[PDB]
Structure 1
């Protein structure tokens, strides 16, 4: 798998991730993204792919 499928786990106390695709040979770093989380229904920073 060249471009590989990963997820975006919320840093809150909520068991929710989004899901997207990353590459290996372009990004050695993990992905930080602010995103909505429908438990507290606000926007939380996301990290921890897979």
Structure 2
């Protein structure tokens, strides 16, 4: 969207699977503070949980 973006930021959720695959959504930094930890499907295998890469 736009640059200034203090609350909510487009973060990319990259896999642990080392496949290559990632996701994108938004986190508030008011409430995530540290990191983001989520469990979604991987289409290069089946279902292997990612972490909030920059």
Above 0.5 in TM-score? yes
Q: Identify the structure with the greater strand proportion.
A: 1
Q: Which runs of 4+ in 1 moved over 4 A?
A: none
TM normalised by structure 2 equals 0.78
How many equivalent pairs are there?
Answer: 49
Normalising by structure 1, report the TM-score.
0.83
Mark the structure with the bigger radius of gyration: 2
Gaps (5+ residues) in structure 2?
none
